[PDB]
């Protein structure tokens, strides 16, 4: 399971 | 043993050509198991090992959805980072991310991974405390302030300490067959003659797993640091690896040089000379 | 931030004339990711070579493994031609079976 909706830079 | 779950993410802009290329590749103990590629004919998460065809269509539909969402987000990040660095709209740029967890025997979190790069340079990384970030330059400080205000460390912790560990254990169970196996190297020497009566001695290691390996050349105890030409471990493309280490020696003297091969599938190293 | 790609051309299994086998072209240590890679038989483009299996390492440099099916013979030559931004000219590495 990948982290999903990586945080916006 | 001590085992890892790592995702390697890439977004590359291609302005005037199309929309960015987005990729997620997942590794377990540095072995590739899943892949999403936005440039595939029908872009979806796909199994890249045997033991992952054990998951039903809901696993794949759900990981695809996440990849399709992360894709849209990395497009915005590429535009955001142009602004921070005051770069033109016309050039190609890359964001890469390493996202992962590593546990030992306890089955509890040793080390949390979340590190970013922009055009191949360190940008920002979660610290080992799983609370703070380290910025590599001025631009990354802007991301840092944004991420603190939003409590982004915490949401990432929850995944890292929770969901990341629990899917690691599950993936090991499903895949241990192949992941914790041990293919011992088969090793040999080749003699190629070289100008001004010298010979290249090349020590080969073939068909080994895992990738971790050490090759040494020596003359009666002493290990030849300087002289050794050493290629990077390469995949055979069947899940086993190849490597070689070489030295230049004078003709007539080949027989005095010895190669050692250390690997987890050998209680004692292999020893080999020429012929 | 341009990096000179390292090119290795080698066979999956130890080579036997007449015996089907896989030829690998391993290109490493390059950035940016855009790269063109052709595999050649007697200096002629081999068709349908997979230029898809791409990833990168802890140092952020990209690497791709291309592969194609081949039956080695005593006279046939094999090579890998690589074109990167970091290079004025394509670099051709030959398959060397005695290495
Ligand atoms: Ni020999
Ligand atoms: Ni091109
Ligand atoms: Ni194939």
Residue numbers in the entry:
A (entry chain C): 1 to 9
B (entry chain A): 1 to 275
C (entry chain B): 1 to 99
Reported in the publication:
Mouse MHC I is also called histocompatibility system 2 (H-2), which is located on chromosome 17, and there are 3 classically expressed MHC I genes, H-2K, H-2D, and H-2L. MHC I and CD8+ T-cell epitopes interact in the peptide-binding groove of MHC class I molecules and form the peptide-MHC I (pMHC I) complex. The pMHC complexes are translocated to the cell surface and recognized by T lymphocytes with specific T-cell receptors (TCRs), resulting in specific cellular immune responses and pathogen elimination from the host. In addition, using the structural landscape of H-2Kb bound to the Gp40/15-SVF9 peptide (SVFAIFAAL), we delineated the molecular basis for immunodominant C. parvum Gp40/15-derived T-cell epitope cross-reactivity toward H-2Kb and human HLA-A*0201.
H-2Kb complexed with SVF9 was crystallized in the P1211 space group with a high resolution of 2.3 Å. The comparison showed that the carbon backbones of the SVF9 peptide in M1 and M2 are not coincident, and the distances between the P4 and P5 atoms of the peptides could reach 1.6 Å and 1.2 Å, respectively. Although the conformations of the SVF9 peptide in M1 and M2 are different, the accommodation of residues by the 6 pockets is roughly the same. The major proportions of P1, P2, P3, P6, and P9 in the SVF9 peptide are accommodated by the A, B, D, C, and F pockets, respectively. The SVF9 peptide bound to the H-2Kb cleft via canonical primary anchors of small hydrophobic residues, P2 Val and P9 Leu, characteristics similar to those of H-2Kb and HLA-A*0201. In M1, there are 16 hydrogen bonds between the peptide-binding groove (PBG) and the SVF9 peptide, but in M2, there are 19 hydrogen bonds and one salt bridge.
